[PDB]
Amino acid sequence: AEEIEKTRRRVNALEYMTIPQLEETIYYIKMKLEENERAEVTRLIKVKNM
Amino acid sequence: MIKEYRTIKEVVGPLMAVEKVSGVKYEELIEVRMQNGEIRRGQVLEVQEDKAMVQIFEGTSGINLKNSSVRFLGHPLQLGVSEDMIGRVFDGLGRPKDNGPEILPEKYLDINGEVINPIARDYPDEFIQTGISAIDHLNTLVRGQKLPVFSGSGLPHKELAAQIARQATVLDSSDDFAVVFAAIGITFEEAEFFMEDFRQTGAIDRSVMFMNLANDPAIERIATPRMALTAAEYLAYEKGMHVLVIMTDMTNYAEALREISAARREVPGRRGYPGYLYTNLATLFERAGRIRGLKGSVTQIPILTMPEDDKTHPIPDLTGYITEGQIILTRELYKSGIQPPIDVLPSLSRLKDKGTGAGKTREDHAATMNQLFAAYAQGKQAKELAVVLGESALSDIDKIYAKFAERFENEYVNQGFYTNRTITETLDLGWELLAMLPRTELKRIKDDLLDKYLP
Amino acid sequence: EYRTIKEVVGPLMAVEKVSGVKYEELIEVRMQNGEIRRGQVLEVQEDKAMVQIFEGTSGINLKNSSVRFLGHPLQLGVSEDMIGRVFDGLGRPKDNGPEILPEKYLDINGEVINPIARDYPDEFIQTGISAIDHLNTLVRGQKLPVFSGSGLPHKELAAQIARQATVLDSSDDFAVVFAAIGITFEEAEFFMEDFRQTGAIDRSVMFMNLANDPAIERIATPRMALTAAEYLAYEKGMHVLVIMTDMTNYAEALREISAARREVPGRRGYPGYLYTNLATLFERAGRIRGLKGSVTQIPILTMPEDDKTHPIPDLTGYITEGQIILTRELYKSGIQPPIDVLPSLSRLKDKGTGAGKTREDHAATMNQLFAAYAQGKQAKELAVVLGESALSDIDKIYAKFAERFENEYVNQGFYTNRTITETLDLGWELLAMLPRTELKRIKDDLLDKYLP
Amino acid sequence: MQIGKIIKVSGPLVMAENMSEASIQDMCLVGDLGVIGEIIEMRQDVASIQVYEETSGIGPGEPVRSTGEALSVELGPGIISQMFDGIQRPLDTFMEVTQSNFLGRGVQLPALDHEKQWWFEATIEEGTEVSAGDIIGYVDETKIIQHKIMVPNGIKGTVQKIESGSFTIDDPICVIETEQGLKELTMMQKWPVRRGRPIKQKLNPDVPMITGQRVIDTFFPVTKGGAAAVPGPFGAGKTVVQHQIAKWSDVDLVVYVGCGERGNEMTDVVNEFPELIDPNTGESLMERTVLIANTSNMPVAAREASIYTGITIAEYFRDMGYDVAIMADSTSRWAEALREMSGRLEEMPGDEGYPAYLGSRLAEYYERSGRVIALGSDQREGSITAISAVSPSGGDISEPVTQNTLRVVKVFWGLDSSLAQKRHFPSINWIQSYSLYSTEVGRYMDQILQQDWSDMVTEGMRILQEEEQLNEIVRLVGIDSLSDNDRLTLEVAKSIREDYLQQNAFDDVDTFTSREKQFNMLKVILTFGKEARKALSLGAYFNEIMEGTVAVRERISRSKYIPEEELAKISSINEEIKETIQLIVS
Amino acid sequence: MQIGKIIKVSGPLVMAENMSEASIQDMCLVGDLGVIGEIIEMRQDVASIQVYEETSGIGPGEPVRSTGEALSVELGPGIISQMFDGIQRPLDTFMEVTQSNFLGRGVQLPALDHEKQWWFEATIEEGTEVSAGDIIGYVDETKIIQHKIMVPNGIKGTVQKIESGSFTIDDPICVIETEQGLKELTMMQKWPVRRGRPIKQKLNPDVPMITGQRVIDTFFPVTKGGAAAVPGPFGAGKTVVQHQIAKWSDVDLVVYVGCGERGNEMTDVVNEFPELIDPNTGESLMERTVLIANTSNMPVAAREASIYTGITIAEYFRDMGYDVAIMADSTSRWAEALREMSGRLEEMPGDEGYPAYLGSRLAEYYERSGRVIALGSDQREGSITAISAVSPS
Ligand SMILES: [Mg+2]
Known part of the structure; x- marks a missing residue:
C-alpha cells in the first residue's frame, strides 16, 4: 500500500506539476523566440532604409 | 564673447538641430533661450559642417523655433565642486535644491572625468564590515569596490542600501564614509526614505545628494550619475575622503539612454538599447577604487531593478559583466520573510579573497564560506526535491541538508535590516550551522580548522 | 585600365565611370606601390561598379590606384592531370608540384540537368563503415550528407570515407574530389597528410580553402570542386565521389557577401535565396543517360548549437536524400564514429542493396537491427524509471543488445575498414543474442541460412 | 604636406x-x-x-x-615585464611623463625605453649571408628569457660590421651589405599589427601544455600552438582560469591582453605576478610576462588594437623559438567594439547587430596562432597558444561571437552558471566542453606515463556522460528505483566531480596539479569504482560497500591536497581500496 | 514592343x-x-x-x-502525354533541340509543337452564333482522350467559315464575325496561370470519386471536385498510393505536379508514371496525363508556379466537360519557393518565415478546384479533384 502511494505521488507530481511546467515553458519559449525573430527582421528593414 | 545663434532648424522631442553654426565642439554644453526668456541647458551630441545636434535636458516643450536662440558655452558639462557640498542637496544637474547658501566652486570638473591609469590603481582589499552576514562572509565587500544590488520592483532594496550605509565600517580604524547619493528617476517616497534615514542617523551631514525624481525630465538622468561620481572622485582623491556612492535606479538611467538613442534614430541593439550600453555603463562603474599614494577611495554600490526579474536582460547582464560581483535579491526569499532577501547562490564578490583571512577577518573565513555555499546549494536542492516528492522520498543525509538550508535562510541570511553583526559573530554563527552537518561532509575545510572551530 | 576609384568602405570599393562591366566579374587592383590585388564585382551600375577585394583594402590610396576588369568571372582550368593534385579554393596549385596547363576554362555554376536525362542511382558504395554501409547505404549518384557539430569528429569521419570508399567489382576506380571550405590550417593539413600517408591522394583532387581565406573564395570552393568533379565524371567517364566540409562555413561566407549588397536577411539571418543556392550545389550529382561516370556527394555540415531545426541542416535535408547524424552523446561515450542510426536516413538505400549488390539479407537485417536497437534503448530506460525488477528476461537481452550494438557494431574506429560481408555477419552475431522468436521482421527463408 | x-x-x-x-x-x-x-x-x-x-x-x-x-608595434628589448595600453603606450611611463594618475589626450609616447643601455652579444660572424629571421646576437633582457635580435623582414644581404657592447635600441649594432646598399640595423624593428609575421611553415601542435588544471590537462587539453576559447556568463570565472594558465603553464612567455575589462584585474597582475617565483627557474613571473591593458572605460576602438598589438608581440617572441601563450580577456569586447562602430557607420549588420564580417576577423586572428617553423637559417620551432575568453549575453552561446569562435578554435571550455553557483570551480561544463586534441594528447600521455591513460580519460568521460543520462531521468522520477550498479556509477561520477574536477585556485597545493599527480588521483577514483564494481558482482550490496569505505573514500577526497613530493600517499590508496573492498565480502 | x-x-x-x-x-x-x-x-x-x-x-x-x-501556358493539341517544368518548358523538346542534357540559361522553347499536323474535325456549322466555351470541333490527341477545341474567352459572334481537315495549332480553322469585326480562331489559346479560368457556376462536390481503395472510398471518401491532404513520411508508401489514385479514379485526365522535389525522387516520378497502365484500355497513363516536373535546383519561379501551371491545365480540360484530377507533390516544397520569394522581396515575414499571404495563396489554389458548370450554351459539367501531398520538416 505504501509503495502504491509513493508511486501515486510521483505519477501525480509528474502529471500535474512537472509536465505542465515543461509544456508551456516550451510554449512560452517558442513564442518568445518567434517574437524576437520578427523584432530583428523589423530592425534590419529600418537599417536598410537609413 | 558669448556665442549664440538664432538659427534653429528643427525640433523633435528631446533633440534639436541648429544650422549656420561655427566653432562648435563635440559634447559642448549649450543653453536654449526660449522665446519666453526661460533657459534650458543642453549638450552637443553631434557636429557636422555648419550643423549641430543637441539634446535638451529639460525637453523642448512650448518652444518656438524662430524666436528661440542657442548659446554655446565653449566647454563641456561641468560641476562646480567644493567641500561645501557636504550636507547639501542638489538636483539632477548639480543645482541646489535644498534652498541653501550659494556654493563657491573651488574648481570646475568635466563630469565625464578621466580613466584611472591601471598602474596608478591601488588594489582594493580593505574589508568593509557591513554587518550583513550574507555579504560580509559570502560576498565580502571591500573598500573601493563596485558591488551593486540586483533587485526588482516591490523588493526592499532601499532598505538594504540604507543599512549598508548605516553599518559600513573598516576594522581597527575610526574612519567613516562620506556618502554620495544619486537618485535617478525614483519616486518621492523612494527618495524620502533615504532622506529621512540620513537625517535620523545624522549621516545627512556626511552626505552629498544629487536628486533626479520621477517627475524630473528623463534626459537629466544621463548627467546625474556623472555628477555624483565627479563629486565622489573629487572628495576622495582631492579631499582625501573615503566615499561610499549609492546610485538608484540604474535601470532608469539605461532607459534614458535608449530614449535619446531612439530619438537619434541610432542603429538599435537588443530591445532598442544602443550598441554602446556596455561601454556607457562601464564609464560609470569603473569610476571607483583606490589610487597609489592617495588616502581616499571610492566605493560604488549601484542599485538596479531587473526588468521582468530577468538578469539576462541587457541592463543587469551588462552590469554584471562590468561590476566586481553583485548582490541579488529574489522575490521568493522576500515572501519567505527573509531580511535582507539575499540569494547567495547567484550572488558574487570578485574581491573577497585578498580582503579576508588572517589579519583581515579570520583564518577560517574562506573555508567556511565555500562549505556553507556548497551545503546550501545541496540543501536547497533537497528542499525543492522534498516539496514535490515528499519528505520520505529523500536520502537521510539529504534531509539533513534540507534542514540546514531552511535553518541557513532563517537564521544566517535573515538577520533584519537593523542588525549589525560583527565578522566574528557571523563566522561563529557559520560554524554553528556547519555543526548540524556530519564532519565527513565538510570536504572543503581542512582538518586544521575542523579540530579548532567545529563544536 | 581605370584610375577612377570613388569610395572605399571597408573591404568594399566603388569604381566609377566604367562600362561593359558584368556581375561577378573578376578585377585587378594596382595600388600606388605597384602591389597587385584581385577582386570581384558584387554590384554593377550605370557608371559605378562595386567590388570586394579578397586580400582587403589596407594601405590603399584610391586616387593613385587603378582597376583592371578581367572581362571574365571565376573560371576553372581543367585537365586530367588534376588527379593527385592539391589546389586552393580558386583552383590554384597548393602542393608546389609541376604546374598544370589546362585543357579549357569552365564556369563553376554548372547546368541544371534535364529531369528526363537523369539516371537512377544503382551501385552500392562500400564506405567500410557499418553504420553507413548497412543501415544507411550510400549509393553511386546519391547526395548523402553528414550532420555533425562543433568538436565532433566529422574530420576523422570524412577522412575515413575518402580513404575506404570503394565499389565492389568495377575495376575502374574512384576519383575522390575533396573540398575544404573555410576550415583551419591544422584541419586541412590533417586531410592533406592523411591522403598522402595512405596513398589516397593519387586518386584524389583537392580544393583547400582556409578559414582566414577570403569569403568569396570560400563560396567558389564548392562550386569549383563540383565543376572539376563533373568534368572528370561527364567528360572523362570517371565515377566521382565528392566530400565537402564544412558547409556551415559556406553559408557564413554567403551571409558576409549578402550584407555587403545590403540585402535584408530571411530566416535566422540567412539570405532569402539560400535554398536555391544550396539546391544549385547539392543537385550537381547523380548519373546521366548515355554517360558512363557518376557524381556522388557527401556534403558535411556542423549544426549550430547541435540544432537540427537550424536553417542549414533544415534546408539541406530538403535537397539531399537523407542524412548521417553524429551526436555528442555517442562521442562522449567513446563511440567512434559516433553515428546515431535512429535519426539517420538514407532515402536511396533500397536501390543499392540485395543480391548481386550485397547479400539478400541486407534490407532484412537492417530493419531488424534498427528495431531491436530502439527496443534496447527503451528497455535500458525502463530499468531506471521502474528498476531492475520490472525488466523481463527478454528486456534484459534487448538492453544488452543495444549496449553491444553501440560498442561493437557502431564503434569500429576511424581506421577500421569493414567489408559489407564482415558487417552483415557481425549484425547477425548481434541478432544471435535475441531468441529466434523476436526476429519477426525477417523471413525464415533467410533466417535459417544466416542466423548464428 | x-x-x-x-x-x-x-x-x-x-x-x-x-x-x-x-x-x-x-x-x-x-x-x-x-x-x-x-x-x-x-x-x-x-x-x-x-x-x-x-x-x-x-x-x-x-x-x-x-x-x-x-x-604598429616597436619590437625590441624593453618589452618584457611592461604594461602597455591598446596602442602600445607604456602606462608607467605615461604616468611619469604626464604627472597624473589618469589617462589624458594627445600624448605621444615611444613604446620602449629608447635611452636604456642594453648589452648586445654578437654571436654571428661578419661575412655571413643573412635573411629575415636570422639571429645576429642576443640581449639578456631577463635572467631566463634571452631576447634575440633577428634580421627584419625585407632585409637580405651580408654581415659587414658587427660587435658586442652596450647600446640603446637606436644605436646601429649591425650593418648589412644589400643589393640596394648598406643597411644599418638596430635592436628594434617596427611591425604592422594587422599583418601576420611571416613564417617558413606551420606545424601541427602535438605537445600538450601543462596547465596543472585537472579538468583541462586531463579531459580537454590544449597543445602548445593550440587554440582555446573560454565562453561563459559573468561570475563563471573566465578570468581566474586564464590567470591560472598564465601563471602555471610550461611556456616560455605569456602575453596577457586585458581587452575591454576591469582595471583592477590588470592592477592585480602587475602586483601579484612579480611575487610569484618559480623555484626551478628562480625568477619572477612578471619577467616572462607582457601586459596589454585597454580597460572597459578606455577608448573603444583601442580594444581591437589591444588584441592585435598582443598577438603581434607574441609572434615576435615566437620567431625567436619561444613557446608563447596569449590571453585575450575578453574577445567579446573586441567584437562589441566592432558592432558599436558597425552601427555608427549604419552598415547592414549580421546577427545580433555584429558586422557580417565578424567571423572573418576572428578567423584571421586565431589563424595567427599555432606551432611554426620560424623564418631563418636555424629553422627554429616556435608556438603561439591562444586562450580567449568569450562573454556571451546571458551565457547564451548561441551568439555569433562564441559561434564564430568555435568554428576556428579546437578547444571549447564551456563555463556554466549552475556549476559557478554551486562553487564547482572551474565551472567547466564537461558535457558541452570538448578538445579536438584529446586523441593526440592521449597518445602522448600513454607514452610518457607508460600507462593506459587514454582508456582512463575515456572511461572517466563515459562515466560522467552516463551520470548525465541518469540524472535526466532521476530529475523527474526520483532516486527510488536506481539499481546498485547505477548508484555506484553516480558515486564514482560524484567522486570525479568533487575530488578531481573541482579545483581551488586560491589554495596553495590545489592551485596546481602535476601530470603524475593527475594520473594517480584519477587512477585511485576509477580503481574504487572498478573494485566496487566487482564486489557488486559477488553478491555484495551497494550500501555495505559505502558503509565500509568511509575511511578510504576520504583519502580520495583529500587526495588533491597531497603535496607533490609525497605522491606515494596516493598510490597506496589503490592497495587499501582493493583490501577494504574484499573484506566487505565477509 | x-x-x-x-x-x-x-x-x-x-x-x-x-x-x-x-x-x-x-x-x-x-x-x-x-x-x-x-x-x-x-x-x-x-x-x-x-x-x-x-x-x-x-x-x-x-x-x-x-x-x-x-x-502563362499554351493550351491546345500537343499538350497531353507531355512533360513540362513549372513554367511549361517541354522537357522532351529540350533534349531534341538543344541536343544536351541540360536546361540551358536563356533557352526558350515553345511548350507545344507548332508544326505538327493534327486532323481537325468540325462539329459545328455556319451561321451558328457562338459564345465563349462552345465546342466548334474536336481532335483526337491521343488514343484515349478526345481534345475538344473550344472558343476562347472574350470572343462572341457568328461563325462565318469552318471546315474539317489537317491543320497545325497556328492555322486558321474557324472565322467568327464579332462586334469588333472578323476574328480568326486557332487551335491554341493562352492563359495566365494565376488567373482562374471563368465558369458559369461553381457547384457542390457531392459525388464521391471511385478510387477502388477501400480505406478511402469507405471511411475517408473524396468527392469529384473535393480536395485531400496527404502527409508523406519516408517509407509510408505514398508513391504506391498516388499511383493507385491516378489510374483507378474515374477521372478523364490526371495532372501530376512535382514541386521542387529531390533530383533522384523526381526521376522516379518522371519514369515510373509512363510505366503506369490505364486499366480500361491498357495503354500508359501518360495517354491521359500531363506531368509537371520541378527539381530543387530549378528556378524558384518554376517551383512556385508549378501547382498553378498544373491546375490551369486542369481547368482547361475541365471546361471541355472532363473530370480532371490534379495531384501535387509536394506542396510543402512549393511553399518553400514562396518563402524564398518572400525573403528576396524583403517582405515582412509571417509565421515561421512564410509570407503573410501564404493562407491566401493556398486558398486561391484549392478554390480553383471543384465541380463547375463550364461556360457555353451546352452548360457542360466538369470537375477538378485535388490530391496534394504535404511533406513538412
Ligand atoms: Mg572576466
Missing part, C-alpha cells in the same frame, strides 16, 4: 575632408589636441576616422595630419 | 530603363542571354526585375525583352 580638415565629429567617429593623398588604415593626428586615429573609410577626399582616444571638445574646422603609417 | 536597357545588376535583382510599355508581373528575358525574369516594381520607365536564374555575366547595357504577358 597635406592637412585634412574635420567636417564631422560624432563619438569616436570623425570624418575629415582634404585627405586624398592619405591611405586606408593610416594612423592620424586628429584635431588641435592631436589625438590618435585611423582612417577606416575614404570617399573621394573625405576620410572616415575612428579615434583611439576621447573626442570631447573636438569640432569641425580642426586639422588632421596623417602619419602615413598603419598601427 | 519596346526593348529594355539594364541599368543595374545586383544579385537576383535587375533594374532596367525603357520599360515604360511593359506591365507588372510581366515575364521578361533579361540580358543578352535572356534569362528568366519578372517585373515586380516600376518607377517611371525603370523596372525592378527579379531574375530567377543566375545573373552572373549580366551587366548594364544589355537588353530586356518583355513577353508582353504574365506567366
Whole structure:
C-alpha cells in the first residue's frame, strides 16, 4: 500500500506539476523566440532604409 | 564673447538641430533661450559642417523655433565642486535644491572625468564590515569596490542600501564614509526614505545628494550619475575622503539612454538599447577604487531593478559583466520573510579573497564560506526535491541538508535590516550551522580548522 | 585600365565611370606601390561598379590606384592531370608540384540537368563503415550528407570515407574530389597528410580553402570542386565521389557577401535565396543517360548549437536524400564514429542493396537491427524509471543488445575498414543474442541460412 | 604636406575632408589636441576616422595630419615585464611623463625605453649571408628569457660590421651589405599589427601544455600552438582560469591582453605576478610576462588594437623559438567594439547587430596562432597558444561571437552558471566542453606515463556522460528505483566531480596539479569504482560497500591536497581500496 | 514592343530603363542571354526585375525583352502525354533541340509543337452564333482522350467559315464575325496561370470519386471536385498510393505536379508514371496525363508556379466537360519557393518565415478546384479533384 502511494505521488507530481511546467515553458519559449525573430527582421528593414 | 545663434532648424522631442553654426565642439554644453526668456541647458551630441545636434535636458516643450536662440558655452558639462557640498542637496544637474547658501566652486570638473591609469590603481582589499552576514562572509565587500544590488520592483532594496550605509565600517580604524547619493528617476517616497534615514542617523551631514525624481525630465538622468561620481572622485582623491556612492535606479538611467538613442534614430541593439550600453555603463562603474599614494577611495554600490526579474536582460547582464560581483535579491526569499532577501547562490564578490583571512577577518573565513555555499546549494536542492516528492522520498543525509538550508535562510541570511553583526559573530554563527552537518561532509575545510572551530 | 576609384568602405570599393562591366566579374587592383590585388564585382551600375577585394583594402590610396576588369568571372582550368593534385579554393596549385596547363576554362555554376536525362542511382558504395554501409547505404549518384557539430569528429569521419570508399567489382576506380571550405590550417593539413600517408591522394583532387581565406573564395570552393568533379565524371567517364566540409562555413561566407549588397536577411539571418543556392550545389550529382561516370556527394555540415531545426541542416535535408547524424552523446561515450542510426536516413538505400549488390539479407537485417536497437534503448530506460525488477528476461537481452550494438557494431574506429560481408555477419552475431522468436521482421527463408 | 580638415565629429567617429593623398588604415593626428586615429573609410577626399582616444571638445574646422603609417608595434628589448595600453603606450611611463594618475589626450609616447643601455652579444660572424629571421646576437633582457635580435623582414644581404657592447635600441649594432646598399640595423624593428609575421611553415601542435588544471590537462587539453576559447556568463570565472594558465603553464612567455575589462584585474597582475617565483627557474613571473591593458572605460576602438598589438608581440617572441601563450580577456569586447562602430557607420549588420564580417576577423586572428617553423637559417620551432575568453549575453552561446569562435578554435571550455553557483570551480561544463586534441594528447600521455591513460580519460568521460543520462531521468522520477550498479556509477561520477574536477585556485597545493599527480588521483577514483564494481558482482550490496569505505573514500577526497613530493600517499590508496573492498565480502 | 536597357545588376535583382510599355508581373528575358525574369516594381520607365536564374555575366547595357504577358501556358493539341517544368518548358523538346542534357540559361522553347499536323474535325456549322466555351470541333490527341477545341474567352459572334481537315495549332480553322469585326480562331489559346479560368457556376462536390481503395472510398471518401491532404513520411508508401489514385479514379485526365522535389525522387516520378497502365484500355497513363516536373535546383519561379501551371491545365480540360484530377507533390516544397520569394522581396515575414499571404495563396489554389458548370450554351459539367501531398520538416 505504501509503495502504491509513493508511486501515486510521483505519477501525480509528474502529471500535474512537472509536465505542465515543461509544456508551456516550451510554449512560452517558442513564442518568445518567434517574437524576437520578427523584432530583428523589423530592425534590419529600418537599417536598410537609413 | 558669448556665442549664440538664432538659427534653429528643427525640433523633435528631446533633440534639436541648429544650422549656420561655427566653432562648435563635440559634447559642448549649450543653453536654449526660449522665446519666453526661460533657459534650458543642453549638450552637443553631434557636429557636422555648419550643423549641430543637441539634446535638451529639460525637453523642448512650448518652444518656438524662430524666436528661440542657442548659446554655446565653449566647454563641456561641468560641476562646480567644493567641500561645501557636504550636507547639501542638489538636483539632477548639480543645482541646489535644498534652498541653501550659494556654493563657491573651488574648481570646475568635466563630469565625464578621466580613466584611472591601471598602474596608478591601488588594489582594493580593505574589508568593509557591513554587518550583513550574507555579504560580509559570502560576498565580502571591500573598500573601493563596485558591488551593486540586483533587485526588482516591490523588493526592499532601499532598505538594504540604507543599512549598508548605516553599518559600513573598516576594522581597527575610526574612519567613516562620506556618502554620495544619486537618485535617478525614483519616486518621492523612494527618495524620502533615504532622506529621512540620513537625517535620523545624522549621516545627512556626511552626505552629498544629487536628486533626479520621477517627475524630473528623463534626459537629466544621463548627467546625474556623472555628477555624483565627479563629486565622489573629487572628495576622495582631492579631499582625501573615503566615499561610499549609492546610485538608484540604474535601470532608469539605461532607459534614458535608449530614449535619446531612439530619438537619434541610432542603429538599435537588443530591445532598442544602443550598441554602446556596455561601454556607457562601464564609464560609470569603473569610476571607483583606490589610487597609489592617495588616502581616499571610492566605493560604488549601484542599485538596479531587473526588468521582468530577468538578469539576462541587457541592463543587469551588462552590469554584471562590468561590476566586481553583485548582490541579488529574489522575490521568493522576500515572501519567505527573509531580511535582507539575499540569494547567495547567484550572488558574487570578485574581491573577497585578498580582503579576508588572517589579519583581515579570520583564518577560517574562506573555508567556511565555500562549505556553507556548497551545503546550501545541496540543501536547497533537497528542499525543492522534498516539496514535490515528499519528505520520505529523500536520502537521510539529504534531509539533513534540507534542514540546514531552511535553518541557513532563517537564521544566517535573515538577520533584519537593523542588525549589525560583527565578522566574528557571523563566522561563529557559520560554524554553528556547519555543526548540524556530519564532519565527513565538510570536504572543503581542512582538518586544521575542523579540530579548532567545529563544536 | 581605370584610375577612377570613388569610395572605399571597408573591404568594399566603388569604381566609377566604367562600362561593359558584368556581375561577378573578376578585377585587378594596382595600388600606388605597384602591389597587385584581385577582386570581384558584387554590384554593377550605370557608371559605378562595386567590388570586394579578397586580400582587403589596407594601405590603399584610391586616387593613385587603378582597376583592371578581367572581362571574365571565376573560371576553372581543367585537365586530367588534376588527379593527385592539391589546389586552393580558386583552383590554384597548393602542393608546389609541376604546374598544370589546362585543357579549357569552365564556369563553376554548372547546368541544371534535364529531369528526363537523369539516371537512377544503382551501385552500392562500400564506405567500410557499418553504420553507413548497412543501415544507411550510400549509393553511386546519391547526395548523402553528414550532420555533425562543433568538436565532433566529422574530420576523422570524412577522412575515413575518402580513404575506404570503394565499389565492389568495377575495376575502374574512384576519383575522390575533396573540398575544404573555410576550415583551419591544422584541419586541412590533417586531410592533406592523411591522403598522402595512405596513398589516397593519387586518386584524389583537392580544393583547400582556409578559414582566414577570403569569403568569396570560400563560396567558389564548392562550386569549383563540383565543376572539376563533373568534368572528370561527364567528360572523362570517371565515377566521382565528392566530400565537402564544412558547409556551415559556406553559408557564413554567403551571409558576409549578402550584407555587403545590403540585402535584408530571411530566416535566422540567412539570405532569402539560400535554398536555391544550396539546391544549385547539392543537385550537381547523380548519373546521366548515355554517360558512363557518376557524381556522388557527401556534403558535411556542423549544426549550430547541435540544432537540427537550424536553417542549414533544415534546408539541406530538403535537397539531399537523407542524412548521417553524429551526436555528442555517442562521442562522449567513446563511440567512434559516433553515428546515431535512429535519426539517420538514407532515402536511396533500397536501390543499392540485395543480391548481386550485397547479400539478400541486407534490407532484412537492417530493419531488424534498427528495431531491436530502439527496443534496447527503451528497455535500458525502463530499468531506471521502474528498476531492475520490472525488466523481463527478454528486456534484459534487448538492453544488452543495444549496449553491444553501440560498442561493437557502431564503434569500429576511424581506421577500421569493414567489408559489407564482415558487417552483415557481425549484425547477425548481434541478432544471435535475441531468441529466434523476436526476429519477426525477417523471413525464415533467410533466417535459417544466416542466423548464428 | 597635406592637412585634412574635420567636417564631422560624432563619438569616436570623425570624418575629415582634404585627405586624398592619405591611405586606408593610416594612423592620424586628429584635431588641435592631436589625438590618435585611423582612417577606416575614404570617399573621394573625405576620410572616415575612428579615434583611439576621447573626442570631447573636438569640432569641425580642426586639422588632421596623417602619419602615413598603419598601427604598429616597436619590437625590441624593453618589452618584457611592461604594461602597455591598446596602442602600445607604456602606462608607467605615461604616468611619469604626464604627472597624473589618469589617462589624458594627445600624448605621444615611444613604446620602449629608447635611452636604456642594453648589452648586445654578437654571436654571428661578419661575412655571413643573412635573411629575415636570422639571429645576429642576443640581449639578456631577463635572467631566463634571452631576447634575440633577428634580421627584419625585407632585409637580405651580408654581415659587414658587427660587435658586442652596450647600446640603446637606436644605436646601429649591425650593418648589412644589400643589393640596394648598406643597411644599418638596430635592436628594434617596427611591425604592422594587422599583418601576420611571416613564417617558413606551420606545424601541427602535438605537445600538450601543462596547465596543472585537472579538468583541462586531463579531459580537454590544449597543445602548445593550440587554440582555446573560454565562453561563459559573468561570475563563471573566465578570468581566474586564464590567470591560472598564465601563471602555471610550461611556456616560455605569456602575453596577457586585458581587452575591454576591469582595471583592477590588470592592477592585480602587475602586483601579484612579480611575487610569484618559480623555484626551478628562480625568477619572477612578471619577467616572462607582457601586459596589454585597454580597460572597459578606455577608448573603444583601442580594444581591437589591444588584441592585435598582443598577438603581434607574441609572434615576435615566437620567431625567436619561444613557446608563447596569449590571453585575450575578453574577445567579446573586441567584437562589441566592432558592432558599436558597425552601427555608427549604419552598415547592414549580421546577427545580433555584429558586422557580417565578424567571423572573418576572428578567423584571421586565431589563424595567427599555432606551432611554426620560424623564418631563418636555424629553422627554429616556435608556438603561439591562444586562450580567449568569450562573454556571451546571458551565457547564451548561441551568439555569433562564441559561434564564430568555435568554428576556428579546437578547444571549447564551456563555463556554466549552475556549476559557478554551486562553487564547482572551474565551472567547466564537461558535457558541452570538448578538445579536438584529446586523441593526440592521449597518445602522448600513454607514452610518457607508460600507462593506459587514454582508456582512463575515456572511461572517466563515459562515466560522467552516463551520470548525465541518469540524472535526466532521476530529475523527474526520483532516486527510488536506481539499481546498485547505477548508484555506484553516480558515486564514482560524484567522486570525479568533487575530488578531481573541482579545483581551488586560491589554495596553495590545489592551485596546481602535476601530470603524475593527475594520473594517480584519477587512477585511485576509477580503481574504487572498478573494485566496487566487482564486489557488486559477488553478491555484495551497494550500501555495505559505502558503509565500509568511509575511511578510504576520504583519502580520495583529500587526495588533491597531497603535496607533490609525497605522491606515494596516493598510490597506496589503490592497495587499501582493493583490501577494504574484499573484506566487505565477509 | 519596346526593348529594355539594364541599368543595374545586383544579385537576383535587375533594374532596367525603357520599360515604360511593359506591365507588372510581366515575364521578361533579361540580358543578352535572356534569362528568366519578372517585373515586380516600376518607377517611371525603370523596372525592378527579379531574375530567377543566375545573373552572373549580366551587366548594364544589355537588353530586356518583355513577353508582353504574365506567366502563362499554351493550351491546345500537343499538350497531353507531355512533360513540362513549372513554367511549361517541354522537357522532351529540350533534349531534341538543344541536343544536351541540360536546361540551358536563356533557352526558350515553345511548350507545344507548332508544326505538327493534327486532323481537325468540325462539329459545328455556319451561321451558328457562338459564345465563349462552345465546342466548334474536336481532335483526337491521343488514343484515349478526345481534345475538344473550344472558343476562347472574350470572343462572341457568328461563325462565318469552318471546315474539317489537317491543320497545325497556328492555322486558321474557324472565322467568327464579332462586334469588333472578323476574328480568326486557332487551335491554341493562352492563359495566365494565376488567373482562374471563368465558369458559369461553381457547384457542390457531392459525388464521391471511385478510387477502388477501400480505406478511402469507405471511411475517408473524396468527392469529384473535393480536395485531400496527404502527409508523406519516408517509407509510408505514398508513391504506391498516388499511383493507385491516378489510374483507378474515374477521372478523364490526371495532372501530376512535382514541386521542387529531390533530383533522384523526381526521376522516379518522371519514369515510373509512363510505366503506369490505364486499366480500361491498357495503354500508359501518360495517354491521359500531363506531368509537371520541378527539381530543387530549378528556378524558384518554376517551383512556385508549378501547382498553378498544373491546375490551369486542369481547368482547361475541365471546361471541355472532363473530370480532371490534379495531384501535387509536394506542396510543402512549393511553399518553400514562396518563402524564398518572400525573403528576396524583403517582405515582412509571417509565421515561421512564410509570407503573410501564404493562407491566401493556398486558398486561391484549392478554390480553383471543384465541380463547375463550364461556360457555353451546352452548360457542360466538369470537375477538378485535388490530391496534394504535404511533406513538412
Ligand atoms: Mg572576466
